[PDB]
Amino acid sequence: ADDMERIFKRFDTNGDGKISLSELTDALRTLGSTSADEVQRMMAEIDTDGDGFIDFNEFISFCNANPGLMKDVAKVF
Template identity: 35%
Template sequence: MSPLSSNDLERIFEKLDKNGDGQVSVEELNWLLERIGVEFSLQEIESLVGKPSLDWNDFLFFYRSISTPDSNDGDNGHGDGSANDHDDESDLVKAFDVFDINGDGFISCEELESVLRRLGVMEENSSRDCRSMIHVYDTNLDGLLDFEEFKHMMLHNTIS
């Protein structure tokens, strides 16, 4: 998967904002999380986002905070085994499991496409090629992303 562009994020935001008020509520965010198989209570989600709803700028900040390593969290970049390292790895495992629909330890083109469609990033007749998206991070060229390749992709993710 290539990094989500601002256009992709804007489409996700618009799909989440079901009532069109320019805000994504914790209920609307919970709807998305449930669709991709992640279970949180509304209180947990509000605690994560810090408020009952997110405007576009808050949504971008939230996305960046969960998709980009935080260089100011006390991690010196050397993987010193701190709690933050463990939490980051645990979050990556959970994210990987969302994409690894069949549980075989790999993300295929079909699985990637399925999750991106559920997220509203890909349209039914989209011309995007999931194979080329996977190819960017597929270091062993098997056409699949294993956890290490996925981790590399997520840790080097930037918003274009």
């Protein structure tokens, strides 16, 4: 089972296969109500290649380290 898949469809509001400051924010703003000011900082560490976008691979690379989040995000997202 790939829970990150179904959830990946949310974070990827652009439906292009990556998460930017416009898409990511949509998540942290829906579950946290934050802004891009923190997004660029959150993805900056998640980005395994750092290209201004968060792919699917890196998405799990970092998310995996956050077992307490994947449980909350997979509850609504």
